[PDB]
Design a protein around this ligand. Structure first.
Ligand SMILES: O=P(O)(O)OC[C@H](O)[C@@H](O)c1cnc[nH]1
Ligand SMILES: O=P(O)(O)OC[C@H](O)[C@@H](O)c1cnc[nH]1
Ligand SMILES: O=P(O)(O)OC[C@H](O)[C@@H](O)c1cnc[nH]1
Ligand SMILES: O=P(O)(O)OC[C@H](O)[C@@H](O)c1cnc[nH]1
Ligand SMILES: O=P(O)(O)OC[C@H](O)[C@@H](O)c1cnc[nH]1
Ligand SMILES: O=P(O)(O)OC[C@H](O)[C@@H](O)c1cnc[nH]1
Ligand SMILES: [Mn+2]
Ligand SMILES: [Mn+2]
Ligand SMILES: [Mn+2]
Ligand SMILES: [Mn+2]
Ligand SMILES: [Mn+2]
Ligand SMILES: [Mn+2]
Ligand SMILES: [Mn+2]
Ligand SMILES: [Mn+2]
Ligand SMILES: [Mn+2]
Ligand SMILES: [Mn+2]
Ligand SMILES: [Mn+2]
Ligand SMILES: [Mn+2]
Lengths: 186, 186, 186, 186, 186, 186
């Protein structure tokens, strides 16, 4: 049956619930209190064919940082849980996706060793109300709990929304590849 | 008994109440009308083991500047009052604390001569709704009324929230050291 | 009697009322819909000893630009009206004022020829909700309708609020000097 | 009556007595054990029309530093005391004075917030037996206890005695302006 | 009683056993098949007062890399286990230690978030038979499984053995501080 | 009982007597014929809680060099003697202390191998009558006879007296730490 991982975590700052199906149909059901992040999690579901269910609340009066971080941490853990024994999967993923003028290359390995390589240069400080420093932190936190090797390379781009969104498209497609069955490893 | 300092000050712009216990247990009770500052004052309490009670209101319609300044001024005065005759204390504090990639070295002396040395380079203009120029002004104002020699050195950091928060962790730990009894000066 | 100038102007975008007494006592009564500008107009009154009455409404949904501009234009006209025949006045003003680390030199002549020389470098984009580009535009518009020669020189400064506020202090003091009676020109 | 401030302070290192009349006639009566400093305090009295009475002794065997510092601290306190409630005064001062080729601009505000901006470049290490590093320290210490905002800008100069002396002339004249009654604030 | 963590892990490449006592007496009992690493683990025990028991074998015919990595991973896990609920500890550590001309500053937080900041510049490729690239990898792997925030700053140094050994001295002393009881958090 | 070291040495150039108590109460009793050095030795006693008794005479007609050197040599020997078998001590010390704008980091190890790392940049040639080249020589000579590893790093500073004095404060505090009992090495 489908590989599903679920995490619930409450702290004094945030409360987060995540459920991810690696064998999904792109069902997008994310509400973090951070609308731009919800849009990116929808991208993860649609471009990766994951089913993504996220609920979070938190101390957004301070800033979006703790919520963003705790959502990412929980997603990484949910991915780890869903992966189970990791038998028979491709393990590696590699994809370069555009959004108009933006072009982002993502390469990853479900290695069990956390590492983020990241060189995005996002030229504005806010996309809507979303602090663009939080993009790197989202991926770093996700890597840290999932135990993923992840490289994100900005090949082109000028519009901040395009850069970030193309990153999520490429990541989702690379992660779909990595999590799928390898037909010669059954 | 415990060294407690209290200040109340009302101006045409702000109204501030501060009570600080140098011999506290980290009781955090700060409401300034500036949520990010409240978070940093919680850090001061938790990392310093001060009991910190702050209430402020002010002209935040203009910007957070007058409130931030008047809170800092009052805290410096409250620290001065709490210190009393300053007998038997370590006087000096020195600590370097991280928050992830950020690393901040704080050195201080409860000297009676105000000085701020500060080289933070905070790469974004807003953390939540908090103007990052206000960090330096908070420490400068606090130094001016407390009569503290304070040096803040940014050794590493990229995320603005991490840089500022690590600064408060390091400051709190250095100030705890300085305010504690020196076992050989009794 | 006192030199008073009054202007009312309604356009499709803004509605502005200004009354200025050159021989005032620093009565501050400004409500523009732009809180930071209200604070600066209070500075004008208090540091210049002008009585300043301003009411404005406008299309702040778009941005503060049209309101800021129309307020400034009306103030310049009100100053011109109040000056009347300009007999017996000092005409020239010259003052350098600080606000903490900021230091601003203003020199002006009530010449009848508009000119703004301005070299402020305001290092952040927003003070509260006030767009810092609007400072230069305020002075330019005021100069244009008053027919003033005005030079503003930033000698020092780092905090944007301090830079802008010191500018208004220096301007107010220079304008007080220029508008006052010359004891040898009666 | 005249605004007079008096300070006496004895430490293990120095003994200092200061009496300053803000409403003086330039009576110069300074003996610090540092002859060049006595000359500068005479300049303060003569160019500011303060009456300045200073007596100091100290550990000049070590160097002039502690004496210079403690004299400056006491002067700042005496100024603060003499100012009293600060009602009706100009508050701000601004003057540029030469001594031959030297030209020094001083701007100050009796603000209650200490700040020194200082860019003198004194090209020799000793004027007589006076260590030229002590000039900055004199002004810094004075600012710290008086709660003054003070900016000192070297516009020209080559001879060290001229640079330092012009600074005291300009400071004295700016401080006279700041401390005098504002005829419209009675 | 004493906080002890134990890890055993066998892979196709290496076999590692670690037992660490956080409340030790500096008992040094390390045999990794990598003599220079054994020397550094002795330093960890002696300078940290940890009891350190390590046994490892592995594919040193290929190079020391897999053994070094797997030892480090296991040590990080053993530290995590030994820490237990982490109640009442200092949590943060900060120390700068020399070895002759080498001087290394280590700052760490037992945060639960892995991060390594590292700027060593080791000027030779081999210390004995030990590949000096393996130093960074040892700390990175240890951080990854322990969930430690760790910064290592080379302040001075020329001799590779001195640089690496001073790093272990400083790390051990910082980790001792972090793991010890905070007398005010009981 | 208290760890006391005493040295007497007469040469054709100087005559020096030193007695140091590592377990002192900050008793300061130094007379070298070099007043600035006496002030620094008082700092050593007060900031380190050493009891420091020094008497020296010498050929100060030539310059202060031989006296300064011979005092330092004797102090290093006295420290070595007082340390005795060096059992149970912390051995390492690490502290960063300010004096106003100056900030100096000292790290040391009572290693038995002499080394001085020193990067002070003292911007004037004389503090009082004390030749500022003699600061480095004092520490070098002390290191050479004590067998100490000592690093002195200037992090900030402009006033020569402040730079040198902060160095002695930091050194004294680091040396107090190194010489004190380690509670876990009894
Ligand atoms: O690539 P998708 O099919 O998910 O479509 C993306 C949308 O165009 C949208 O999110 C967008 C287009 N430009 C910025 N954002
Ligand atoms: O160090 P603390 O125990 O006070 O925890 C701090 C929190 O992690 C939090 O304030 C934070 C983490 N990243 C940004 N902020
Ligand atoms: O100079 P004033 O007496 O008008 O006082 C100004 C206030 O201190 C205030 O507007 C301010 C201080 N720092 C930023 N703003
Ligand atoms: O300007 P004053 O009237 O006080 O006269 C100053 C003197 O000329 C004197 O102090 C001087 C001239 N050159 C260096 N010093
Ligand atoms: O600092 P320790 O007491 O552990 O002694 C270290 C030894 O001197 C030694 O490991 C060494 C000295 N130079 C390189 N290595
Ligand atoms: O830090 P201490 O308590 O020893 O006080 C030092 C004195 O202020 C003094 O030595 C000094 C202050 N500025 C230069 N020297
Ligand atoms: Mn974070
Ligand atoms: Mn989109
Ligand atoms: Mn301010
Ligand atoms: Mn935080
Ligand atoms: Mn316009
Ligand atoms: Mn203001
Ligand atoms: Mn000083
Ligand atoms: Mn002269
Ligand atoms: Mn590897
Ligand atoms: Mn060795
Ligand atoms: Mn010599
Ligand atoms: Mn001194």
């Amino acid at each position: 049956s489908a590989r599903i991982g679920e995490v619930k975590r409450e702290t004094k700052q945030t409360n987060v619930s995540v459920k991810i199906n690696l064998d999904g149909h792109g069902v997008s059901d994310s509400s973090t209190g951070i609308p731009f992040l919800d849009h990116m999690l929808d991208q993860l579901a649609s471009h990766g064919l994951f089913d993504v269910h996220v609920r979070a609340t938190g101390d957004t009066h301070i800033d979006d940082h703790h919520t963003n971080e705790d959502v990412a941490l929980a997603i990484g853990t949910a991915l780890l849980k869903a992966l189970g024994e990791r038998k028979g999967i491709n393990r590696f993923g590699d994809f370069t996706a555009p959004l108009d003028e933006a072009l982002i290359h993502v390469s990853l390995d479900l290695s069990g060793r956390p590492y983020l390589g990241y060189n995005l240069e996002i030229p504005t400080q806010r996309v809507g109300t979303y602090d663009t420093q939080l993009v790197e932190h989202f991926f770093q936190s996700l890597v840290n709990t999932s135990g993923m090797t992840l490289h994100i390379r900005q090949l082109a781009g000028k519009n901040s929304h395009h850069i970030i969104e193309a990153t999520f498209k490429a990541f989702a497609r690379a992660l779909r590849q990595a999590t799928e069955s390898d037909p010669r490893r059954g």
